[PDB]
Amino acid sequence: PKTVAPGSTPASTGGVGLGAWISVGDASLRTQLANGDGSLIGIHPQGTLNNVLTVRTPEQYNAVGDGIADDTSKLKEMLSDINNVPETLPDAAAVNSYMEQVAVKIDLTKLYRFTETLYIPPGVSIEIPTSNFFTRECKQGLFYDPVDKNTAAISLMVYRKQPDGSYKLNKDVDYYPTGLDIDNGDAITCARKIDINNLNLITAPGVKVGVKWIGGAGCTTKGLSIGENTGSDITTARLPRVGLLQSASWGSIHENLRILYKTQGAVFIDSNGGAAVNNAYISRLGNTNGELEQAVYKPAGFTEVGDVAVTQFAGSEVKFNSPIIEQASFDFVHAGRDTDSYGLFMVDKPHIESSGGKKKHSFYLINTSSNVTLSGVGLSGQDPDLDS
Amino acid sequence: PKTVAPGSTPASTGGVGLGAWISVGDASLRTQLANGDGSLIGIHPQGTLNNVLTVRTPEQYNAVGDGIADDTSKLKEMLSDINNVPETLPDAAAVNSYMEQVAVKIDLTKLYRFTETLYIPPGVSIEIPTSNFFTRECKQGLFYDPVDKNTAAISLMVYRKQPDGSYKLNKDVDYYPTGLDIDNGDAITCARKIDINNLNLITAPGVKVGVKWIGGAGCTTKGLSIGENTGSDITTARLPRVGLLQSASWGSIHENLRILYKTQGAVFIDSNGGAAVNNAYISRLGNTNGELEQAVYKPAGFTEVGDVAVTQFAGSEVKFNSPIIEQASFDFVHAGRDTDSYGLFMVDKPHIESSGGKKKHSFYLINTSSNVTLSGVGLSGQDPDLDS
């Protein structure tokens, strides 16, 4: 005989399974199926449902997905269930351990409004069926809508050494690690085994940075699409002032990156050795008042006013293959490293265009060398004296 | 007490759920499972089955998938359930709205015979596990087998203005939009957010065009494989006369495109700014009687007879990276724009080969400039006077 004390549960008096408690009847079956993992469902050629379910979705966490409800806590929980990295770690060993976890794929099929910077932990693959392209109304992806706009929508994880030798997660929007920081231990990257395939990211107007791709060595992207082609008034368009900011990401590849921006499209700083940006399509949403934008992250030597599609400095030497750059005051601003002019400016066959032939310069090169191959597409501005 | 009138249903008497009707018993459970969406099946770490099923398949619509039965209506129903765009629309706002719908991924794992031109609507991602490569018998993908062979197997959507001011979906095999048409309002593309991975397309012998990539700006492809290596005799091989016809597709990227053709491999016309074709493998199925093939879509300046692997004109300037071209009379025929010779012919390291060294010309350049990088692979024809 089996004695069951008052206040017992099947889980606390032997568990459910052979030799212990066995579910019997329809009510039990319903609950067993409702709270299971799919192991009760057989599949072909063999095995069970749980054997083949490997992707995660925000819907598993009850995200509304209408771009209205604040789905922040659900997105964080989904991410946490994959790799939950504490914001303060004791030492280098602890932070590095988080890059050694199981990687999981996430599928985003609706629109998720969020209001705090999302930090992607290592071991995360994100996918959406197709990438946005000058899309008028984003229907799938992420919509950053914070109170504090002096922030980034998405950011990779980089830990900064504290006075006591401990490491805290970086949460400063303007911060980016340098090759020096990584070398001398002041910064430790916690960004690896991260893959993006078609992520659409829109932001409330005025958000400072779309994506902070910091410390993402070896991390890859395909079809990353930033910003919404909301309408003619860029002042109210759902796109960030700065699309992407990247540093310490050697060996990182961005394939067919799409960026709609207001102030700066993409910025690459410091160590990005061997990184490539192929077939990028980076455009300001029209060039109305573009000449009045003030670059946010730029080398000291660049003091001109005007929006910049691609900015690179401090020794960064990303390879730009066949980029398409539209409606920019400055297509490219590139400065070599201050010390020795290191950092080759490399652009192969840029497709440069601007409505009404409005432009200041295509290649604003500072203290540097370059190899550029033109493809018969381009122009110089309307000012007969200063544009070239 | 609850009174239920004769002829009632749970729906007509309060509905199902808390405080209303609750299903009970095995018979109810079986029907609930059969007619539900998987919401009764819990999955890990939390949530239910319906939360992670996002991919569509023709089997959901009971397609036979044997390459024999006509699966046309079922393929069309699947595409329609994703984005049902009317063949006739009121105005530009109307046609443009259909590019703002949720995108859905489709997985094709069997072989589907169809008999009418399939029109892919915006917001569709097509996937097949692997791509064909000179395969003799196509086991997965689409098989176009129409009564009227003077048609296309697959086409993107482009709307043409009518005299009354309304727009109708183009169904003309020869039509292709130009920059003018787009600027005039005479044509409005309805092809955005389209992604193809490993699609295998085979067609009945005599079919004019394999794929009409018209207006596919920003649309992408990887492993798109056209034509079957049926047998030695090309007159009965299951491949189209013209593999791919493309226009108004600026920023589109075709990665590892594979085309087995009879008359022309790929044709690029008009605006294709910034578009790229990487690692394409284009080949006629043997050069037998190739010199007799008459190009269908070509510039006025090209009057020679012979099959052409790649044809480009009217200002199109697609970047061809490492293409592999085989068994063609003419590897590339390229014409600069009529008015000003615009449109650079760019080919980097083409791998050109042909059986028995049969060939007329590799680069047939008309009113144009070009930048070509040879990789030590090539040849010139057997005619000691005319071949170069």
Author numbering:
A (entry chain C), B (entry chain A): 131 to 518
What is the paper's account of this structure, in its own sentences?
In contrast, CBA120 contained multiple genes for putative TSPs (TSP1-TSP4), genes that are more commonly associated with Podoviridae rather than Myoviridae. Analytical gel filtration of purified TSP1 revealed a single homogeneous peak at ∼252 kDa based on regression analysis of gel filtration standards (data not shown), suggesting that similar to all other tailspike proteins with known structures, TSP1 forms a trimer in solution (predicted 82 kDa monomer, 246 kDa trimer). The TSP1 trimer assumes an elongated rod-like shape of approximately 170 Å in length and 75 Å in diameter at the widest region.
The N-terminal domain (amino acid residues 12–155) that putatively attaches to the virion forms the spherical head of the trimeric assembly. In addition to electrostatic and hydrophobic interactions, oligomerization of the three head binding domains is enhanced by the coordination to the Zn2+. The C-terminal domain (amino acid residues 166–769) forms a bent 3-stranded right-handed parallel β helix. A short α-helix (amino acid residues 155–165) forms a “neck” that connects the head binding and receptor binding domains. The receptor binding domain may be further divided into two β-helical subdomains D3 (residue 166–562) and D4 (residues 624–769), intervened by a non β-helical region (residues 563–623). The inserted region introduces a 30° bend between the D3 and D4 β-helix axes. This cluster includes a pair of adjacent glutamic acids that share a proton, located on the same subunits of TSP1, Glu456 and Glu483.
